[PDB]
Design a protein around this ligand. Structure first.
Ligand SMILES: Nc1ncnc2c1ncn2[C@@H]1O[C@H](COP(=O)(O)OP(=O)(O)OC[C@H]2O[C@@H](O)[C@H](O)[C@@H]2O)[C@@H](O)[C@H]1O
Ligand SMILES: Nc1ncnc2c1ncn2[C@@H]1O[C@H](COP(=O)(O)OP(=O)(O)O)[C@@H](O)[C@H]1O
Ligand SMILES: Nc1ncnc2c1ncn2[C@@H]1O[C@H](COP(=O)(O)OP(=O)(O)O)[C@@H](O)[C@H]1O
Ligand SMILES: Nc1ncnc2c1ncn2[C@@H]1O[C@H](COP(=O)(O)OP(=O)(O)O)[C@@H](O)[C@H]1O
Lengths: 455, 453, 456, 455
């Protein structure tokens, strides 16, 4: 009669972590800015040394992507995120407004529950560990099952690096054998203060039903408009690099191109030259047959090199092909090329001008991309202003790859791997989530006006 | 063939009718210019201002809470201060450009807002929520507390009518007429509900963060106020009494306990009595205590009641000019009724040796249903203020002001609001005074500025 | 359907109305004499009889299952056999005295009954449940299957109107006109509902026993029939074909697989063919197999359809005088469409070496969605019958009879019923054929006849 | 409270059900004679341990007294055993040759047995006997305040059963009772039937479990003393029943209804046999401790009168056998009109049979519907008239309702699980016994031809 079952063991595990995190966070909350910053620096530096190994671990365990790109993915969290927060004041009085007689104090949310995706398992741990601790919180991680080990390993490195710099034990922890029982327990336990839910909509929904404050994400289905004023060579190059990054595993990555008829041929030609393989009618359907199983995305094509996809669909492509492209006209969840494909596959739509492009992008976003990301390539300022203004996306990327743009690598939004899709994407915010979401502001404010007694 | 009858089913259908009309209304509204929106918002605030007294009378009459003068002032806070704080906010289209970084921001409405309305601030809260929601280009559907169903609906009606006159679409502002759990649940989980603004007790707030929907909740207050020996006592007492006795203590943020430095105790007692306080003796105390808590929870019947009314209920006898009741206290806990949030002109009175002992009791008082809400201190020595305030878990830390008027942003520079988020510690997504910027998302147009290695 | 969106609210409100009306009617009914009750029930059985054909034709027309001749007989079974088995049952006041034990028994109506009706037996099940419920002095509120809403509703009206002509109160018998989960949920959990009679799919029955109310549910059948080498083969095939093809196989207790001794295999095949069975060759079997299941369960579109219609749907070709389809089979499981409950004129045909192998296989077939329901055997060796039947988990173990007519108590002496409890093993509170004695509680008046001791 | 008691207790239930699964399959294979030998050995051990369990039960729960609990245990060991020992439960139990029908006994499988706080050890014995006799396994769940004595009772049963051939795991008991465990037990895949002897909350839960269940209801038994009653004999019978184990059995007298014409004699006779009639001052003090919050006060359950008196702060002679209180009102807020589970008796004056019936009806609606009523009378025509319209499964004539209700002194089946029929949310009004724990399979021969066509 000692606990034997995995659901039950995992609950016990979560409970221990929470007890230890509470005690750890109390200690951490008392430290100075400089004490905190030394801990954060050690972690980022630690992430930097292990970024390649963890990248390789993630590739090995998940079968997604490639080692070089995941290595770069880890460094983004270890470098860019770190740089974006290292100088942020998170301790004590963070703002004084002398003339209005008010000052702001940073206040930790306490204990954070972090849900980690399979696609970005190691990098997402870092990004969250960094911003959480910078704000003086504890954090308990819940991995995607198919990536439990490398995720846990990423967490370990953060804790141990933190500890070397003086952090208490249990500040950073991770469920080692994920279960439904464990995920529910973590989200709802009284000691759990805030949920960062980076996962599919089902899990994000559970988080907004948890009784707890939650920052969730939504899925992407990013349409990109190439206007006839675009630098076509520059645009095709930027897109391919982004689309093929880690073989297209991030959710802000391009899923469909929308192209002005008048430059249609040039863009096609530029694509082919730079490594695109245009599928013919025959090949499309074979590839389409493996894109969706049932009514949802086939997991076996996710983050797979184009040669692997070619073999799987039983077609032959040159070994130097960087991405597959299929010309399409229809949009809907029964047309596999119009959905989010999370792989080096791109749909290709022709448009008459700005209006048909907008109309189509909206159609594409209505398919599970709402509030996430859109892109346009164009040199005409009036067209850019008119196109972007009414698009339902928190990230509207101009003249950049959307993968790198969406996360804040190559455009100036805050570096993040947790992209809020706003209310339209069932989220409390459309922000790239960062350290400022993980502390509350307290306002010390002085009597400055007298309240009237009579009307 | 076609019948209905049970009130719950009718209330559910009503909610469904409102949301549909709200959707259509918001889409038409969303197409309006900043100028057109701002005119609509202006009309609402004007009408609100004029009807403040009438609405105040209905709420006092329907609920039994408070008095018409203070409720009139309360409605005006919403019609004036809240309006003034949002009327110049950019909410249409591009609201910000960052030329050096090559980014610009577009305001995006959340869609349809569900506003839950408490029984204590029923008309003022509708006015406040309607202004910030419509300014952000949303529709809003209200759910009254049952004790205040009629006046709440009337508040909504006045806004819709004021708004529509100024060009707003039909169905933009609506209100459930007979509140039920069924109807509340429908409003919270429905496909058309985009965001919940939940201002109410801990039970409703928990339900809102369990709805599957993005939510801004509140928490309850239990506001402790420290009077330091450096304080201007005569000025502190006056601010305290005006705040505590406002609308007879019905706002979540009213002082509930005074922590007083031993060294000035004598002047404070004398000063309280002179300014209208009645100190209950321990016999009077046990008797008043007997009606504060009822197995279990705060006795609704003393809520927002005049001190003479409360005195009669307890079976004690007090002078007219008496403005509030005070009880001496040493203990803190659910088993000590004078230590809880009382929502009435009743104060606890604790003696402390100094700041360190003051913080300890205050911490203990907050953990009884006040965490993350509001705290107060009266003092003139700036170092004592900083040391005391730095570690208090409250989104509002009010210095040298009444906490009623401070917490809502009337008399201290916090954002005008009647929905006070209590941060993670109060089970809320934010610690801000909720206002117009919380009801639109920002979309970012951002340009390529760097190469990837 | 301008307001069809709120059908959930309408259906709920309607249920509340029906239950309130039911409460008043039953209070009144409970006061009547045995003569009055018995006079009413009789009128209901008589009206059902006259209307048997018209109801039969509505059900066939509305649902597309079955045929008019057989449904007429199904309706008459409820109107005649069920009625006759209950006509003398005492349900008012003191129903039994036991003078030497100094006990007598007083009958107590359960109150208001919630009746769930299947699409396969919509009119006949209304008739059966109405007769036994009212005989026991209860009110009953019906929930139709949505595919069968109109004919079900019509059956209830005929019972109620016929009841009124013989003196019954209004609202005694009612029926939900717009079936919904919301309404079903309301009906099962509502304050005034006392007992649930759930004759429907497994999800609906499980829900009934999750309702907080006492419930009599059913289970599905997957009836295996053993033909032992001692069987009268000519007689058996006749009984089997009649039972299996009745209403085109919609009756759960209908045969689903034959297990045939290897040693007599040649005669059975020949007799089956002569009496109207078509043996599918291996390829015909696959095309028919491919329409048996859609999405991991039975395809509703073949249910209760004529053999020629099934043939057309599968794209195969059979004579017009074929009465049922038969396929040779070796495997058992959900992945073997011929091994599941087919609810249509289709039979599986398994060869077995002897009794012990039949029993192994019989257990396996039941485990695929048939536990506690029905099994059959045809044999003339009493020892073999006894050894085979003894350990089968089925409430009805039918010997030398069609299992359709046997299961329900038409041709064997079990209680006449269209609600077949599958016992604990089938997730039911009883394995009985549900009947009138299940719809009233017994109160016992008992006299002190013994002394409690005072010291140990 | 312990943080992880719930998970280990869930585990224990799971282990028990799985051993019970294996054990029952083995038990089910035995002959009638092997089963009957087992049941007899169980009865003997219950008989031998009656006193030791009684003492444990009194001490752990604070309810009742050791002599009566010992008698209570012996009722289960003897009366129940004797009433079932000759019932056939294996194989063919009946052969109707003219009608051509064989009946075969079929065990329900695994029973979940919920045990009340009032009759912990006696109920275990009772249920273990009828469950095993019908060839089932059973897993018990105690009320937490009686966990140790309940488990001990289960332990003795299994060991008694084992010596005579039973398999291990046949009879088990949750040692750390919890909601989680109870919940796990009622809904578990391996659970076949729930026997729910407990409060109204749990019975509702059992009928909400998705499983077949036999529940009980609460009692609130009114007994009418008609002018035709033998007053001396009636009072003697009533006091014996009412004070048995200090009134802990559910079907215990709670209110007397007395004909005005014999009021005088009855009051004096009650007094003569040890009743103490409370005055207005005493009434109000006692009434104050009968319920706390708006539910029955656990501190008076099964307590001697003197203990109750002291608790209410009144004093009474040490020889007082029961407290009585004259009453006119009926309702949830009149503590003397509700079920008191202790030696307190309401006393109602009535003008005749008709007023008595109305009041009886009102008392039953206060949590006694379907359970038990009593009447003392020698007038045959009144009894018949009084009893016919009472909604109760046990209608006891000229006997104590405690012993009548359980089937000790009137001829209902000896039992400690009393069903309240449909009117009390139960599938039966029977005293539950062994025939409720096996289903009947019917072997039925062809006796008719079906005609294929109608006119
Ligand atoms: N998973 C389930 N959960 C809850 N209830 C269910 C479930 N499955 C069936 N039911 C209950 O039974 C009814 C639906 O049963 P069906 O499975 O649909 O009956 P069936 O005859 O097998 O199929 C016919 C119906 O299904 C459709 O595919 C077909 O077009 C037709 O409407 C409903 O009234 C419902 O209460
Ligand atoms: N260990 C786990 N932790 C969190 N969620 C899980 C876990 N296992 C399963 N899930 C949930 O079940 C589903 C698993 O499917 P997933 O692995 O996301 O497939 P796909 O990648 O094709 O969407 C998701 O909705 C996920 O939230
Ligand atoms: N609008 C509403 N509709 C339905 N129920 C409500 C509503 N507002 C509050 N409630 C319920 O009533 C409670 C309010 O507390 P209550 O005791 O009625 O008044 P108070 O405590 O403010 O004096 C909440 O906890 C909530 O569960
Ligand atoms: N199966 C169970 N296991 C543990 N506790 C239970 C169970 N059923 C009810 N309770 C608890 O028992 C208490 C109610 O006891 P009650 O049923 O009133 O006992 P009594 O019958 O002696 O009056 C509640 O606190 C409830 O949580």
């Amino acid at each position: 009669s000692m606990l034997r079952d995995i659901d039950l063991q995992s609950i016990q595990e979560v409970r221990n972590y929470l007890e230890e995190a509470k005690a750890a966070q109390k200690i951490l909350e008392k430290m100075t800015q400089s004490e905190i910053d030394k801990i954060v620096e050690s972690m980022a530096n630690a992430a930097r040394e292990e970024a390649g190994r963890l990248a390789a671990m993630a590739v090995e365990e998940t079968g997604f992507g490639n080692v070089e790109d995941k290595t770069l993915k880890n460094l983004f969290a270890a470098n860019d995120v770190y740089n974006s927060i290292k100088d942020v004041k998170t301790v004590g009085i963070i703002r004084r407004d002398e003339e209005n007689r008010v000052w702001e104090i940073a206040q930790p949310v306490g204990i954070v529950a972090g849900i980690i995706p399979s696609t970005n398992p190691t990098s997402t741990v870092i990004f969250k560990a960094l911003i959480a601790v910078k704000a003086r919180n504890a954090i308990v991680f819940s991995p995607h099952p198919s990536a439990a080990k490398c995720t846990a390993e990423a967490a370990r490195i953060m804790q141990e690096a933190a500890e070397r710099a003086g952090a208490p034990k249990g500040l950073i922890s991770c469920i080692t054998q994920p279960t439904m029982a464990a995920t529910n327990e973590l989200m709802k336990h009284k000691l759990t203060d805030v949920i960062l839910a980076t996962g599919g909509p089902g899990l994000v929904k559970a988080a907004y039903s948890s009784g707890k404050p939650a920052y969730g994400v939504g899925p992407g289905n990013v349409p990109v408009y190439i206007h006839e004023s675009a630098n076509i060579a520059k645009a095709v190059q930027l897109i391919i690099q982004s689309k093929t990054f880690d073989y297209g595993t991030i959710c802000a990555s391009e899923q469909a191109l929308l192209v002005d008829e008048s430059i249609k041929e040039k863009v096609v030609a530029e694509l082919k030259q730079q490594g695109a393989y245009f599928l013919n009618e025959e090949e499309k359907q074979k590839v389409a047959s493996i894109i969706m199983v049932n009514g949802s995305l086939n997991a076996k094509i996710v983050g797979k090199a184009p040669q692997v996809i070619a073999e799987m669909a039983g077609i032959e492509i040159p070994s130097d092909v960087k991405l597959l492209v299929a010309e399409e006209t229809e949009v809907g969840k029964e047309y596999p090329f119009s959905i989010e494909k999370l792989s080096p596959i791109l749909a290709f739509y022709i448009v008459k001008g700005m209006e048909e492009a907008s109309e189509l992008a909206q159609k594409l976003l209505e398919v599970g991309g709402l509030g996430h990301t859109v892109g346009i390539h164009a040199e005409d300022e009036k067209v850019i202003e008119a196109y972007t203004i009414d698009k339902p996306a928190g990230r509207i990327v101009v003249n950049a790859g959307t993968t790198f743009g969406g996360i804040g690598a190559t455009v100036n939004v805050k570096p993040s791997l947790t992209l809020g899709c706003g209310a339209i994407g069932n989220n409390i915010t459309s922000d790239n989530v960062t350290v400022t979401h993980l502390f509350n502001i307290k306002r010390v404010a002085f009597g400055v006006r007298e309240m009237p007694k009579k009307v």
